[PDB]
Amino acid sequence: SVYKVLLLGAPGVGKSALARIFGGVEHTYDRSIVVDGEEASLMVYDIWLPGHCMAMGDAYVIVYSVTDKGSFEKASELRVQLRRARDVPIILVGNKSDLVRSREVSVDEGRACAVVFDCKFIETSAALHHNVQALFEGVVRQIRLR
Ligand SMILES: Nc1nc2c(ncn2[C@@H]2O[C@H](COP(=O)(O)OP(=O)(O)O)[C@@H](O)[C@H]2O)c(=O)[nH]1
Ligand SMILES: [Mg+2]
Numbered sequence: 001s002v003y004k005v006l007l008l009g010a011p012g013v014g015k016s017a018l019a020r021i022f023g024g025v026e027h028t029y030d031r032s033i034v035v036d037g038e039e040a041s042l043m044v045y046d047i048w049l050p051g052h053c054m055a056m057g058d059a060y061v062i063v064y065s066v067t068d069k070g071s072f073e074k075a076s077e078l079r080v081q082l083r084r085a086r087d088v089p090i091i092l093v094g095n096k097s098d099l100v101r102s103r104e105v106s107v108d109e110g111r112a113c114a115v116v117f118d119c120k121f122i123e124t125s126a127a128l129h130h131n132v133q134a135l136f137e138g139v140v141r142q143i144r145l146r
Contacts, residue, residue, distance in 0.1 A: 005139055009048065062090060063093040066096050
């Protein structure tokens, strides 16, 4: 299967950092990955014309930075905007988990946001490559489920 995934979020949260790691780069990315014994190719659009960007993907990844409370609030704005434009899979991502001292958003607040959105939540660190692979395999699983 071939899927389009759009990365949404406030500037500076790590969208491009996460896309490049997935794409294997040091825009858009493609890459086939095997999830649960089945291969799937994901086309990741790191392009966040808001209306135009929101009317495409087969899934959306809303990213905020755990060190930026404002970016977390922006995640809620994006979810509302998305509801006004599109039952497509949404994954909420709290990035920069490695910056422990500068955290501004707790893991609990992230999990609570996910309960409100009724979506999957994961925390990542583009700096350490932690949970990056898990994020995209998760997008594939959520798409198949829907
Ligand atoms: N320490 C740390 N820095 C990160 C992480 N992800 C992104 N950054 C940094 O945050 C800034 C914004 O990164 P960028 O990928 O351009 O975010 P974008 O604007 O959402 O695309 C850069 O200074 C990155 O080096 C992370 O997981 N840990
Ligand atoms: Mg970027």
